[PDB]
Symmetry: D2
Subunit: 139 residues, 4 copies
Amino acid sequence: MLWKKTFTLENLNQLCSNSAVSHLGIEISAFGEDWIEATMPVDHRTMQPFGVLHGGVSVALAETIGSLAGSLCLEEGKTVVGLDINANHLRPVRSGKVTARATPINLGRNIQVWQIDIRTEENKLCCVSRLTLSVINLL
Amino acid sequence: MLWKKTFTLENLNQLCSNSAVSHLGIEISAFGEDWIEATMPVDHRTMQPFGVLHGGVSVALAETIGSLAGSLCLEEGKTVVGLDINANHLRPVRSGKVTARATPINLGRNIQVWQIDIRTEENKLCCVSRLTLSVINLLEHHHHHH
Amino acid sequence: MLWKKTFTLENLNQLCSNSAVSHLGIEISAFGEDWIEATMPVDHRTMQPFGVLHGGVSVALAETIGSLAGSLCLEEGKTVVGLDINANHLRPVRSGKVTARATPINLGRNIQVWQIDIRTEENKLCCVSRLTLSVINLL
Amino acid sequence: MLWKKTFTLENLNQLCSNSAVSHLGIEISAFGEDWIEATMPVDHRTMQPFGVLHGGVSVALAETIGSLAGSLCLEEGKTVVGLDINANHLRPVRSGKVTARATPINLGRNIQVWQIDIRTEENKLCCVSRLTLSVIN
């Protein structure tokens, strides 16, 4: 597969425990040959005071799954550091959970670029984001 | 002065209770004639699994203060909706709380562009972000959405 | 289809004459039901001093085709205004022409979001861009 | 002072000659201890078909001056490569020339982040951009 490291969803969620990731109710939910997803509930933990998904939190989810995906595409001795991220919020979301799928745009020796698209339970696109990661050698 | 809506930090923080804002420990902390700030602690609620501030959460803070700021620059009957945001993470933060200050770049009739810079308690720049907002006429929006 | 305005590639290139578009040798080259492309040569008009395609000019191409695509998706009497754009440069390009394809992410009543991917003659992705547009009534 | 390399404006314009930069009429126009500027005309070479400055071309100018500034902040033997760039177009510009000023946000050993604000001849902000660069040998 695209991944260079071995892993399990159980282990990834264990790794993300007791942090902002688990605090937001984010869960690494599934993965394929060249994509990985995380879900996040749409509730008082992730909504703006007026009842809709908080766009800033949608970006937090995007950076989470994209950075995780990036790290899984590196051998031991190397990791990724988030350089920058951007996102367009396309529509309001007020219930259920959203699903963010991270897919690679380009994985180079020094820089990785990831695409993260977030959809509602109705499979409607609510946010599109791009993440730029720096590949560092733990030397 | 920039503001077109009256407000108090007490009421704003009350309004933000039971939301993603309060959940992250974010507090609207100060304001001036043309800027407003929000603080956020660096702890289990906002850190990555390895002890440093989560970059995504930093953007969550930036969108929070930038959007609030924009809504306060409009008269009753109008509000804002976040269109897009971008940010560069400049350095890791491992303790204390960070302060995000939102300042206007351009406040147009249909679009607002805001600058949000986040600094550590050491006054060091850890994140820079730009937020684009759509100005919505509530009356018009209702008539076309209901 | 996706388009709401009637058009021919000939007329679109005519529309772009004597502007930054023709000055950069950009040509509106092809279109499908939900995508439109423009090509641009990699030469002294578009290269960096060191012999590779100028990244800033790639963005110019992206904004050009994305903005054109957006206006063609609106009824007559309406057009678009570019609000913001971002892009990641993935690899250097030294020769040939690049092709930028614009496809919609979300087309709303007041805002449009477009995806623009630029490829080399070898069909390798050299730039990915996202453009946000404001829809305006010329009246 | 930010600059690690020695140069004159004439050198910089010579460096950018016979490229997209000179093709767009861009001229490195002035510099200070921690900032550098480039101007660009608003004419048929840089306008959209409807008479206003082409937003994409504004980004071209932004990347040009920001990338140049970044390389000048490095020791001899080192340069930069543009990783990504973003920009918000704030208002239409229909005449004269615009001036883009690049100022640093953060200069690291491997990555540099630059702010580039573009103003009209009336000193009105028409575009704001941020550029991310990678430092290479």
